[PDB]
Design a protein around this nucleic acid. Structure first.
Lengths: 7, 365, 365, 7
RNA sequence: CCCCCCCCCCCCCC
């Protein structure tokens, strides 16, 4: 679940 | 019957020799460099913010990412024109967005990442992965506690990276150790809001990356300068951009502190300027300042650009004036740890004594 | 012989470097903002009036509604042009009226509500419904007691909102706390007639909204300035418009109080200006003032526009002149709570003593 | 009748 | 040969 962070 | 016709004007003649050349020099003919089209500014901004909020094992290409942001802010074709006008034949290469692979983003599309020439994609992947892991950990610690200003996607993160770069730019006539120490010391204060927003940006490593970039790719110095020129000409801007321009102006007279200190010694009315040994040199001193006036506003950037023409602005052939200037600066206490050589020790001592006496006393005109 | 050629002119060179740039910067490439066609001017006035006469849960987009009124006043395409000339690549999105639903108005048609890009429709709907409930309660309590100037449809409600905006604008070089306190204090007096017409306009919350909008969208500052310039150039107007132009002109020299206080220190014949430390810096002081004269009328708007070029006007490299200037301001009682640092305490004390003696005593010339 | 006010 | 130090800015009132 690491590549869908909002940033 | 009079010694009026004895005159040489040698420094103006040397400047006219170097300036009036009909042949340009070609360098870096077979080489290439990377730029990013302005339409990818958002995509570069994120990257410029992901070097900031995580602790990375390697900071090799941070300066390159800052230059990529400069390219997006100026334009790829305009950056190619800038690098050509700096006197380099480097062939601009264009940044390409590539899909990572099977990985998908929150929007349901393929995760597109930047592909910069000369930067291994593995470095970009590891920077992005470490930043994502760091933010995942931070949100695990606290929920909903991350505002926009603490996120990598903040529009000013490229400007923060470039402000660390500008701090290392101010010390480009110094050595690497002094420059790094100065950059860290001044960034602890000047970039304090950024260091509060991003508590884990490794300023020493980013500064070393920028120093490296300014060593290998000298033409990028020109690019850097153009950014400052392009940034101080804008009607508006952010606070970080004003900070960048402030440091960029602080870099102005770099490599020519003896001219500024001689103007100070004249404004300080050091009586030892009237010593006959200095008096025999004020004519060539005046020629050096006349050369500065002839060169104009671009004379301050001569050492930052690393122009071969720099060194015509040297006062090293007037040792007694240099000694008196250094002594006046030392007496006022502004000499600091300047390592310029003092040829005449006696003139230095007398000038320093007079300047200390002048500074201690107070008078009203 | 003579120390006459020893002259540098560095600040003029720095301004020449910044001003003479042939590359424009590109920021906000993929961002968008909202404008309103002037046809909807009435429908925005109502909105600006519904923020004023009711106590609202949230005031997030009150500043945006003021900017929308400015957009109707200047024109949407003119606002595109202004934003483009401000140096930002923001793409305008146009405001659109939409039918609320089955709701019917007094004229028999559907109730048309404004739709503003970036402003969620829930906020506009809740402001509208809250203001309508407030008017229903006021009519129920008092019948026939509502004049025109106590209604949301009064033509000057956008100008009252923008007067609070101009109050917060005057303190854009200060901090948020000082700016909010100054805005509330000065709005209690300056906007006293408007506050008497609308006894429940939340000035602190509107002012905080305006500060937020000015920080987030720097280009809007320029838009604001254009409105002021377009307002002071009108042949006629209302009293609210004249008040807006008065506050807008009070915002002029913001971020440069040291230049004005130096002119005051000279005008007061402060004899500590004759101190040798001040004489050693008067050259660069005069050079900063010459830079002001060269920039011209737009120099006062440099800090309001948040121009990166701002900082050339700084007098921070003349610590003795600055100390004497601050001492003269303190002796006259002018300084108030100015937080500018005082480098030389002895010159500050001497200048304050002389200024106190001069102000307390009287003379005839 | 909240939406029929004159405003 | 040259060079070599230090330093964001802003901040009141109307």
């Amino acid at each position: 679940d690491i590549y869908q962070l909002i940033m | 019957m009079s010694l009026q016709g004895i005159h040489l004007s040698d420094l103006s003649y040397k400047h006219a020799i170097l300036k009036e050349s009909q042949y340009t020099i070609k360098r870096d003919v077979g080489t290439t460099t990377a730029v990013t089209p302005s339409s990818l500014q958002q995509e570069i901004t994120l990257l410029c913010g992901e070097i900031l909020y995580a602790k990375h094992a390697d900071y090799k290409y941070a300066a390159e990412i800052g230059i990529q942001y400069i390219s997006t802010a100026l334009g790829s074709e305009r950056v190619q024109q800038i690098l050509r006008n700096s006197g380099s034949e480097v062939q601009v290469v264009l940044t390409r967005t590539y899909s990572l692979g099977k990985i998908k983003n929150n929007k349901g599309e393929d995760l597109q990442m930047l592909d910069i020439h000369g930067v291994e994609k593995s470095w970009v992947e590891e920077i992005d992965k470490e930043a994502r892991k760091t933010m995942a950990t931070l949100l695990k610690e606290s929920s909903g506690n991350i505002p926009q200003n603490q996120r990598p996607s903040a529009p000013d993160t490229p400007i923060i990276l470039l402000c660390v770069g500008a701090l290392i730019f101010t010390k480009l006539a110094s050595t690497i150790e002094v420059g790094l120490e100065t950059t860290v010391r001044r960034a602890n204060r000047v970039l304090s809001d950024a260091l509060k927003r991003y508590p884990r940006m490794d300023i020493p490593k980013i500064a070393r990356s920028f120093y490296d970039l300014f060593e290998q790719k000298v033409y990028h110095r020109s690019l850097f300068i153009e950014y400052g020129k392009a940034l101080g000409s804008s009607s508006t801007g952010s606070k970080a951009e004003s900070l960048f321009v402030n440091i960029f102006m602080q870099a102005y007279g770099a490599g020519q502190t003896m001219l500024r200190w001689g103007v100070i010694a004249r404004s300080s009315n050091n009586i030892m300027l009237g010593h006959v040994s200095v008096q025999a040199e004020l004519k060539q001193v005046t020629e050096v300042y006349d050369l500065v006036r002839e060169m104009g506003p671009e004379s301050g950037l001569l050492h930052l650009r690393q122009s071969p023409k720099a060194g015509l602005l040297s006062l090293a052939n007037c040792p007694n004036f240099a000694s008196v200037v250094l002594g006046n600066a030392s007496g006022l206490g502004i000499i600091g740890m300047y390592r310029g050589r003092v040829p005449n020790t006696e003139l230095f001592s007398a000038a320093e004594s007079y300047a200390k006496s002048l500074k201690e006393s107070n008078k009203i005109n």
